[PDB]
Design a protein around this motif. Structure first.
Motif, PDB file in Angstrom:
ATOM      1  N   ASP A 118       6.200  -1.303 -12.763  1.00 49.37           N
ATOM      2  CA  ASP A 118       5.827  -0.720 -11.457  1.00 49.37           C
ATOM      3  C   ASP A 118       4.761   0.333 -11.782  1.00 49.37           C
ATOM      4  O   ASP A 118       5.064   1.330 -12.453  1.00 49.37           O
ATOM      5  CB  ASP A 118       7.052  -0.218 -10.655  1.00 49.37           C
ATOM      6  N   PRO A 119       3.463   0.110 -11.440  1.00 50.33           N
ATOM      7  CA  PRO A 119       2.422   1.099 -11.723  1.00 50.33           C
ATOM      8  C   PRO A 119       2.528   2.309 -10.787  1.00 50.33           C
ATOM      9  O   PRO A 119       2.120   3.398 -11.175  1.00 50.33           O
ATOM     10  CB  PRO A 119       1.103   0.333 -11.508  1.00 50.33           C
ATOM     11  N   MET A 120       3.097   2.120  -9.589  1.00 50.22           N
ATOM     12  CA  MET A 120       3.318   3.241  -8.655  1.00 50.22           C
ATOM     13  C   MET A 120       4.289   4.277  -9.256  1.00 50.22           C
ATOM     14  O   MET A 120       4.041   5.489  -9.116  1.00 50.22           O
ATOM     15  CB  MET A 120       3.846   2.750  -7.303  1.00 50.22           C
ATOM     16  N   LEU A 121       5.374   3.857  -9.922  1.00 46.28           N
ATOM     17  CA  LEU A 121       6.343   4.814 -10.489  1.00 46.28           C
ATOM     18  C   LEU A 121       6.203   4.965 -11.999  1.00 46.28           C
ATOM     19  O   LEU A 121       6.806   5.914 -12.572  1.00 46.28           O
ATOM     20  CB  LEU A 121       7.760   4.380 -10.130  1.00 46.28           C
ATOM     21  N   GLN A 122       5.425   4.090 -12.649  1.00 38.32           N
ATOM     22  CA  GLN A 122       5.328   4.134 -14.112  1.00 38.32           C
ATOM     23  C   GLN A 122       6.729   3.877 -14.665  1.00 38.32           C
ATOM     24  O   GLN A 122       7.209   4.673 -15.487  1.00 38.32           O
ATOM     25  CB  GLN A 122       4.785   5.476 -14.643  1.00 38.32           C
ATOM     26  N   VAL A 123       7.373   2.786 -14.227  1.00 38.37           N
ATOM     27  CA  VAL A 123       8.680   2.381 -14.790  1.00 38.37           C
ATOM     28  C   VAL A 123       8.663   0.892 -15.128  1.00 38.37           C
ATOM     29  O   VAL A 123       7.913   0.139 -14.473  1.00 38.37           O
ATOM     30  CB  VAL A 123       9.844   2.691 -13.834  1.00 38.37           C
ATOM     31  N   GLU A 132       5.521  15.230  -4.742  1.00 39.82           N
ATOM     32  CA  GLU A 132       4.401  15.780  -5.530  1.00 39.82           C
ATOM     33  C   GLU A 132       3.655  14.635  -6.221  1.00 39.82           C
ATOM     34  O   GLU A 132       2.459  14.495  -5.999  1.00 39.82           O
ATOM     35  CB  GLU A 132       4.920  16.752  -6.594  1.00 39.82           C
ATOM     36  N   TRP A 133       4.370  13.840  -7.028  1.00 43.92           N
ATOM     37  CA  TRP A 133       3.844  12.695  -7.793  1.00 43.92           C
ATOM     38  C   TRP A 133       2.999  11.769  -6.903  1.00 43.92           C
ATOM     39  O   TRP A 133       1.908  11.366  -7.303  1.00 43.92           O
ATOM     40  CB  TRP A 133       5.031  11.969  -8.441  1.00 43.92           C
ATOM     41  N   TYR A 134       3.464  11.468  -5.696  1.00 44.75           N
ATOM     42  CA  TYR A 134       2.824  10.534  -4.753  1.00 44.75           C
ATOM     43  C   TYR A 134       1.555  11.136  -4.166  1.00 44.75           C
ATOM     44  O   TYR A 134       0.583  10.384  -3.983  1.00 44.75           O
ATOM     45  CB  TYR A 134       3.762  10.181  -3.584  1.00 44.75           C
ATOM     46  N   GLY A 135       1.568  12.436  -3.840  1.00 42.88           N
ATOM     47  CA  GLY A 135       0.579  13.015  -2.921  1.00 42.88           C
ATOM     48  C   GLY A 135       1.233  13.383  -1.591  1.00 42.88           C
ATOM     49  O   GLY A 135       1.301  12.540  -0.687  1.00 42.88           O
ATOM     50  N   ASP A 169       0.857  -1.182   0.000  1.00 42.64           N
ATOM     51  CA  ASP A 169       0.000   0.000   0.000  1.00 42.64           C
ATOM     52  C   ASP A 169       0.890   1.228   0.000  1.00 42.64           C
ATOM     53  O   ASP A 169       1.730   1.342   0.893  1.00 42.64           O
ATOM     54  CB  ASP A 169      -0.938   0.009   1.206  1.00 42.64           C
ATOM     55  N   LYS A 170       0.677   2.130  -0.955  1.00 44.04           N
ATOM     56  CA  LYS A 170       1.541   3.303  -1.102  1.00 44.04           C
ATOM     57  C   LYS A 170       1.614   4.085   0.214  1.00 44.04           C
ATOM     58  O   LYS A 170       2.730   4.431   0.627  1.00 44.04           O
ATOM     59  CB  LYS A 170       1.068   4.193  -2.246  1.00 44.04           C
ATOM     60  N   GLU A 171       0.464   4.355   0.856  1.00 48.18           N
ATOM     61  CA  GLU A 171       0.401   5.211   2.061  1.00 48.18           C
ATOM     62  C   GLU A 171       1.179   4.567   3.211  1.00 48.18           C
ATOM     63  O   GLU A 171       1.968   5.262   3.888  1.00 48.18           O
ATOM     64  CB  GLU A 171      -1.041   5.516   2.510  1.00 48.18           C
TER      65      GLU A 171
HETATM   66  O1  LIG Z   1       0.345  11.031 -11.421  1.00 48.62           O
HETATM   67  C1  LIG Z   1       0.963  10.668 -10.165  1.00 48.62           C
HETATM   68  C2  LIG Z   1       0.322   9.418  -9.539  1.00 48.62           C
HETATM   69  O2  LIG Z   1       0.019   8.518 -10.624  1.00 48.62           O
HETATM   70  C3  LIG Z   1       0.872   7.382 -10.849  1.00 48.62           C
HETATM   71  O3  LIG Z   1       0.336   6.618 -11.916  1.00 48.62           O
HETATM   72  C4  LIG Z   1       1.109   6.509  -9.600  1.00 48.62           C
HETATM   73  O4  LIG Z   1       0.378   5.286  -9.529  1.00 48.62           O
HETATM   74  C5  LIG Z   1       0.760   7.217  -8.332  1.00 48.62           C
HETATM   75  O5  LIG Z   1       1.433   6.490  -7.302  1.00 48.62           O
HETATM   76  C6  LIG Z   1       1.136   8.697  -8.420  1.00 48.62           C
HETATM   77  O6  LIG Z   1       0.871   9.248  -7.117  1.00 48.62           O
END
Ligand SMILES: OC[C@H]1O[C@H](O)[C@H](O)[C@@H](O)[C@@H]1O
Ligand SMILES: OC[C@H]1O[C@H](O)[C@H](O)[C@@H](O)[C@@H]1O
Ligand SMILES: OC[C@H]1O[C@H](O)[C@H](O)[C@@H](O)[C@@H]1O
Ligand SMILES: OC[C@H]1O[C@H](O)[C@H](O)[C@@H](O)[C@@H]1O
Length: 444
Positions: free
Chosen positions: A305-310, A265-268, A185-187
Motif C-alpha cells: 500500500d503506497p498510501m500507508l507504506q505497509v 498529519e501523514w495524509y495532509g 483517490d486519497k482526497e
Molecule cells: O509522508 C506522508 C505522505 O507520504 C506517503 O508516502 C503517502 O503516500 C501519503 O499518502 C502521505 O500523505
C-alpha cells in the motif's frame, strides 16, 4: 470452561439487500451503484452480478422459516434506498416500502426482532450522479431517505443502524477502487469518510424523532485486530498507521470528536473537509456500537500500500478461503479495547463468519467443519468478553446464507445455509445445524 450467555442475549444472522434480494428491476427499483459497478470488467472475480442473487425478494417467507429452524431471536438486514426512493429523493415508491413492511410483519409474527441497516452500500445510481459520498450534499440526501423509511417502519422496528462500515464505503469505494463506485483517490476517500460520519450524525435525531422511547440506534464499524510483523520501529509504526486507518479513523471522531492525529498529519490534514460544528454532529449520542469482526491483520513497513507504506504479512496459522487469518482472540481484544477506551453502553457483534469451500454430499448435506470451528472459537471469545463485564448484547453471524460476496461474486460462501444457485434450494449446513443448538441453549 464456558456455558450460558445472558438470558436476554440476541442471537442473529445478518444479510444485506443487494447481496440477497435480486429482483433488481422489480416494482419500481432503480439501479444502485452496484448494478452499474458489476458491468465493469475485472470488478467481480467471477464476472457475476447481484441481478438474481438469492431471490430473497420473492423467497423472504421461506428464508424466515429457515431463520425459525436456526432458532434466531434477531435478524439483521439492510433496506435498499433504490426501492424506497428510486429517483434518490422525492417520490416514495410505495411498492418498495410494501416489501419491507411485509418483511418486518413476517419477522415479528414469527417472534424475530428486526435490526434494520439503512445504508449497506447500494446508493441509487441517479443519486450518486448528483451527490457521491465525497460531495457534502450526500448528507441531506441520506437524511431524507432515513426520514422516509423510519416514518413508515418505526412502529415495528426498534433497532436501527445508520451506515454499514464507513471504512469500506469510503476507502474501498473511493480510495482503492475495489467497491462501487470504483474510484481510487486519497482526497475522495477522506471526503467520503467525513461525509459518512456526518450522515450518521444527522440521521441519529431523525431516527429518534420518528421513533419512541424504545428506539435504539448506532453505526456499524468493521474492526480487525492489528498486529506489527516485528518489534522494528518501522514495523511498529506501520502497524500504528494501519490501526489508525482501519480501526480508529471512525471510532475517534464518534467518541472523541477528532481524527487520529498521527495519520491525519501523514495524509495532509486539509484533505478532510471539516467544517465548524461537524464534530458536534458526528458525536451525537448513540445507544450502542455495532462491530463487524473477521480477522487479525499483520503489518510491516513496506510499499505494497503506497498510501500507508505497509505490506501485509501472513503469520503461520489458519486461513479462510478469503485468505483471512482465523484469530478469535482478536474479537475479545477488539471488544475489550472499545469497552475500556470508549465505554459504549452496549456492543453488538453485527457480523462475524467465514468463507470455506463447500460441497453438497451425495446425501444432500453440507459438511463444513472449518466454518463450525471458526464460529465456535469466536462465540467462546464473545462469552469471555461478557464474563469480563463487556456489555455485549447480541451476536449476528455473517451470513444467514451464501450470497453475492461483492468483488468475489458468488465464489465465496459465508452462509451457515448453502444456496444452490441453479435452483435457489437452501440446504442448512452442518455449521447451521450446530448454530440451531447454540441459539436454543443460549450458549455452547
Ligand atoms: O509522508 C506522508 C505522505 O507520504 C506517503 O508516502 C503517502 O503516500 C501519503 O499518502 C502521505 O500523505
Ligand atoms: O438494475 C439494472 C440491472 O438491469 C439488468 O437486469 C442487469 O442484469 C443488472 O445487473 C443491472 O444492473
Ligand atoms: O470484504 C470486504 C471488506 O469488508 C470487511 O468488513 C473487512 O473488515 C474488510 O477486511 C474486507 O476487506
Ligand atoms: O466481506 C464479508 C462481509 O464484509 C463486510 O462485513 C460486509 O458488511 C458484508 O456485506 C460482507 O459480505
Amino acid at each position: 470452561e464456558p456455558h450460558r450467555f445472558p438470558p436476554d442475549f440476541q442471537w442473529g444472522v445478518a444479510t444485506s439487500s443487494y447481496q440477497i434480494e435480486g429482483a433488481v428491476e422489480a416494482d419500481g427499483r432503480s439501479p444502485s451503484i452496484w448494478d452499474t459497478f458489476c458491468a465493469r470488467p475485472g470488478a467481480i472475480a467471477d464476472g457475476s452480478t447481484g441481478a438474481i442473487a438469492n431471490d430473497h425478494y420473492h423467497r423472504y417467507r421461506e428464508d424466515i422459516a429457515i431463520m425459525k429452524q436456526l432458532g434466531v431471536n434477531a435478524y439483521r438486514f439492510s433496506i435498499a434506498w433504490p426501492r424506497i426512493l428510486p429517483d434518490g429523493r422525492g417520490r416514495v415508491n410505495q411498492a418498495g416500502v410494501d416489501f419491507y413492511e411485509r418483511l418486518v410483519d413476517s419477522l415479528l409474527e414469527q417472534g424475530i426482532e428486526p435490526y434494520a441497516t439503512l445504508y449497506h452500500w447500494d446508493m441509487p445510481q441517479v443519486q450518486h450522479d448528483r451527490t457521491p459520498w465525497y460531495d457534502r450534499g450526500v448528507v441531506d440526501a441520506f437524511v431524507e431517505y432515513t426520514d422516509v423509511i423510519t416514518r413508515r417502519l418505526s412502529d415495528r422496528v426498534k433497532y436501527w443502524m445508520t451506515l454499514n462500515e464507513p471504512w469500506v464505503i469510503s476507502f474501498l469505494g473511493y480510495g482503492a477502487g475495489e467497491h462501487a463506485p470504483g474510484l481510487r483517490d486519497k482526497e475522495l476517500y477522506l471526503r467520503a469518510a467525513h461525509h459518512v460520519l456526518l450522515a450518521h450524525g444527522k440521521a441519529m435525531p431523525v431516527i429518534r424523532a420518528n421513533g419512541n422511547a424504545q428506539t435504539k440506534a448506532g453505526i456499524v464499524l468493521n474492526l480487525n485486530w492489528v498486529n506489527a510483523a516485528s518489534d522494528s520501529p518501522e514495523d511498529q509504526a506501520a502497524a500504528r498507521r494501519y490501526d489508525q486507518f482501519f480501526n480508529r479513523w471512525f471510532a475517534e471522531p464518534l467518541y472523541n470528536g477528532r481524527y487520529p492525529e498521527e495519520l491525519l498529519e501523514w495524509y495532509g490534514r486539509d484533505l478532510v473537509p471539516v467544517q465548524p460544528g461537524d464534530f458536534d454532529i458526528i458525536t451525537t449520542p448513540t445507544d450502542f456500537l455495532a462491530v463487524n469482526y473477521y480477522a487479525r491483520t499483520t503489518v510491516k513497513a513496506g510499499s505494497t500500500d503506497p498510501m500507508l507504506q505497509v505490506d501485509f504479512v501472513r503469520p503461520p496459522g489458519e486461513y479462510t478461503a478469503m485468505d483471512w487469518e482465523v484469530y478469535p482472540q482478536g474479537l475479545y481484544n477488539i471488544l475489550n479495547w472499545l469497552h475500556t477506551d470508549y465505554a459504549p453502553p452496549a456492543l453488538y457483534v453485527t457480523e462475524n463468519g467465514a468463507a470455506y469451500d463447500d460441497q453438497v454430499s451425495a446425501a444432500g448435506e453440507v459438511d463444513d467443519p472449518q466454518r463450525l470451528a471458526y464460529l465456535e472459537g469466536h462465540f467462546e471469545a464473545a462469552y469471555r468478553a461478557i464474563q469480563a463485564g463487556i456489555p455485549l448484547k447480541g451476536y449476528f453471524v455473517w451470513s444467514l446464507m451464501d450470497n453475492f460476496e461483492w468483488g468475489r461474486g458468488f465464489e465465496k460462501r459465508f452462509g451457515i445455509v448453502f444456496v444452490d444457485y441453479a435452483t435457489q434450494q437452501r440446504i442448512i449446513k452442518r455449521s447451521g445445524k450446530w448454530f440451531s443448538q447454540v441459539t436454543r441453549a443460549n450458549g455452547l
